Structure formats: structure tokens, C-alpha cells
């Protein structure tokens, strides 16, 4: 598993569960093409998005549907979604974890890249 | 000034100067249309992007060119750019400050929204 | 003003108003001595804590009373307070801004240090 | 394991390895008494700090020695250490994870409290 996503809720101090995540890959014509998607588990994690063979170097966008998450909790959010855009590089280590910490009017995201 | 941006560098503990910022607005055909652009000043702030008149209700995307910033400093970062997407002025005109805190493999962004 | 504090509320997207702040300085006997205190204003800022003369080199602890803030709003948070501990003025006098971003189960703090 | 610590490095995009962590419990006389300590693993984690029996309700301080961490990497840091102070409450869920994200002049910490 070369690409993982982990999402936390800073208001409840818990994993952000059942959050929709969509991954896109940048195509030759500068358009974003759907690549993989899923919903975070009870542990706020999403595994099995893609495979080593499929995850080639290139520019990727990870869209985290935070607006719907906050709505389902009856909390008014600011962002439409959280966006993480990065280049996958074979030179760098091989396992990518995109971590995100959510607040209604703030979020942080971190990339944990390891071997 | 209804739309301001402020950027800090978490590695140096200073404002992030000369950071390029591009703002887009979602058009009727659902594509992103260029709305405004600029660069942060010595204080890490970017003012004068737009005016109350031009800043109508809509979905806006604020793109902060973090890669170019880190590269202009001999650092190779993870993200291409920080992307902040939000609906603006749906409850009437508001003043928005988009704050960002940058690290090479991480960033946070916060919105401060007030009513004049 | 060599030591300022700014606090934002990440739940409301606004400044965190009337947040109590206590500053301590490490004394010769290695105990924390009260140095200065105040509360953030409507802009979430706390100025006038100290003066250039009184703000000597040392190890300072800035305590931000986040629990009292969240409780004063009918919210039950995780942390007692945010604690920011740092050496100040070891390379000559500097101006420090301690920024904090608050959520009920999370906070971030950033130092912006400049030279006048 | 009711109390865990996880630390990430925002400059390198990796777990923060070999970081010293000291936990204190607040005593009747308002003084902080050593409670548990250790060093983060290769995964930036520290488990086995305490046990269910030992971890009673009370006020705790988790000190993360970030200054030394940055020094060992040849990077000039701002803080002496990161401090996390909180009350352990039996009413709330039972497993506490104190997460911290480190930058030289910034840090965030999050509490993930689950069952
Ligand atoms: Cl959108
Ligand atoms: Cl993060
Ligand atoms: Cl991780
Ligand atoms: Cl791109
Ligand atoms: Cl931010
Ligand atoms: Cl602000
Ligand atoms: Cl305390
Ligand atoms: Cl902060
Ligand atoms: Cl600042
Ligand atoms: Cl100390
Ligand atoms: Cl955190
Ligand atoms: Cl976690």
C-alpha cells in the first residue's frame, strides 16, 4: 500500500469516520482524472486506494470531503473540501501517508513519506 | 479589503515573503475562472486582491504556491501548492482572511471571517 | 512591544476573545516566576505584556488558558492550557509574537520572531 | 495501553524518531511528579508508558523534548520543549493518544480519545 490517508477530528478528538476521499491524477491536458476513492474507516483511515504498479510518478490531488463530514455532525464548516496536491517521486521513499487534521474553519495536512 | 491572505514560515519563524497566490472563482459552466492574483509582502500579507463590488457570492479557490516558495530557498518540499476552497458571501458580504502556516512536508490553513 | 500573543478560534473562524494568558520566567533557583499576564482583546491580541527593559534574556513560559475559554462557551475541551516554553533574547533583543490556533481537542502554536 | 504518544516531523515528512518524552502527574502540592518516560520508536511512537491500573484520573503533563530533536538534526529550534497538559477522565473514552506535529518554530498537538 503506497498511498494511505488518515483523518482526525480536532473538535471531537477522534478519528474522522466515514469521510469521502477522492484521488485524481493530472493528465497531459492539465485536467484532473479520477484515480481512486473511498471512505475512511472507524479508525479514520483509508487503505487500498491503489497499488505499486498503478501508482506511477506524476501529480496527484487528494480531495477530502470535509463539508459533508461537518454537516452530518450538525456543525457549520468553512471549506468545500480539503485539497492535497503533490508529486509522487520514486526517488523519495515508497510509502505515502497523507494525514489531515480537521476543524470547521481550519485544517492541516501532513505528508509522512517512509520506507 | 474583503479578501486578504497571510502566510507564515514555520521553519524560520517569520512571514513567508513573496509567496505567489492565485484566486479562482467557479463559473456557471463549473470550471475555475481566474479571479485575482498577487504576492505576499515583507509582512507575509497580501492585500488588494479584489474589491467589495467584484467579490460576489460564489465558490472560490485560493491557491498558495508553496512549492515555488520552498524551491526559491533551496528546499525540496512535498506539496505542489496549498488549495483553499470555500463558498464566500452566501449570507451577505463578509471580510475573509485566509491564513496559512508552511512547513516543507506540512501546512495548515485557517479562515478568519468577520462582518463589517 | 517585544512580546505579543494572538489567538484564533478554529471552530468559529474568529479571534479568541478574552483568553487569559499568564507568562512566567525561569528564576535562578530553577522555579517559574510570574512575569506578566493579560487577556486577549476583541481582535484576539494581547499587547503591552512587558517592556523592552523588563524583557531580559531568559527562559519564558507562556500559558494560554484554553480550558477556561472553551468552558466559558459551553464546550468541554481536552487540554488544561497551551504551554509555550522558549529561550528569549539569547542573541540580543527580539520582538516575539506567540500565535495560537485553538480547537477543543487540538491546538497549534507558532512563534514569529523579528529584529528591530 | 491507555496512554500513547505519536510524533511527526513536518520538515522531513517522517516520524520523529528517538525523541525523549516525559510524563508527569500533578500532586496535591501543585508540583509535577515524574510518572513515565521513554523515547519514540522508528515509527515515531511511544507505547507502554503506563497501565490501566496506574493511570487514574488526575492532571497530567506530557513533555516532548523537541529542542534536542532539532539539535541532533542540525536545525535551530524555537521551543525548549512541547508541553501537553490535560485531565484524564474515566467518563471519557479509555484510550488516549497524544499526537504532535513538529516544526522548528511551530507545533500542533492533538488528543485522540477513543474506546
Ligand atoms: Cl468545489
Ligand atoms: Cl496534519
Ligand atoms: Cl502517520
Ligand atoms: Cl497542479
Ligand atoms: Cl493556519
Ligand atoms: Cl487573523
Ligand atoms: Cl495544570
Ligand atoms: Cl499556530
Ligand atoms: Cl505574525
Ligand atoms: Cl524549561
Ligand atoms: Cl497534532
Ligand atoms: Cl491517531
From Swiss-Prot, chains B, C:
Annotated effect of mutating residue 107 to V: Requires 2 nucleotide substitutions
Effect on the protein upon substituting residue 85 to A: In a patient with amyloidosis
Effect of residue 51 to A: In AMYLD1; amyloid polyneuropathy and cardiomyopathy
Gene name tied to this protein: TTR
Binding site for L-thyroxine: 6, 45, 108
Recorded consequence of changing residue 45 to K: In AMYLD1; early-onset amyloid polyneuropathy
Any one GO cellular component localisation term in the record: azurophil granule lumen
Name of this protein: Transthyretin
Record key words, sorted: Amyloid, Amyloidosis, Cytoplasm, Disease variant, Gamma-carboxyglutamic acid, Glycoprotein, Hormone, Neuropathy, Phosphoprotein, Secreted, Signal, Sulfation, Thyroid hormone, Transport
Keyword Amino-acid biosynthesis among record annotations: no
Recorded consequence of changing residue 101 to M: Loss of tetramerization
Amino acid at each position: 500500500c503506497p498511498l494511505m490517508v488518515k483523518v482526525l477530528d480536532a473538535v471531537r478528538g477522534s478519528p474522522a469516520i466515514n469521510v469521502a476521499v477522492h484521488v485524481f491524477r493530472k493528465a497531459a491536458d492539465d485536467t484532473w482524472e479520477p484515480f481512486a476513492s473511498g471512505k475512511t474507516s472507524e479508525s479514520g483511515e483509508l487503505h487500498g486506494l491503489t497499488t505499486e504498479e498503478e501508482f506511477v510518478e506524476g501529480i496527484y490531488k487528494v480531495e477530502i470531503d470535509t463539508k459533508s463530514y461537518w454537516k452530518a455532525l450538525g456543525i457549520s464548516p468553512f471549506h468545500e473540501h480539503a485539497e492535497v496536491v503533490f508529486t509522487a517521486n520514486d526517488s523519495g521513499p515508497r510509502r505515502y501517508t497523507i494525514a489531515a487534521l480537521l476543524s470547521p474553519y481550519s485544517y492541516s495536512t501532513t505528508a509522512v513519506v517512509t520506507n
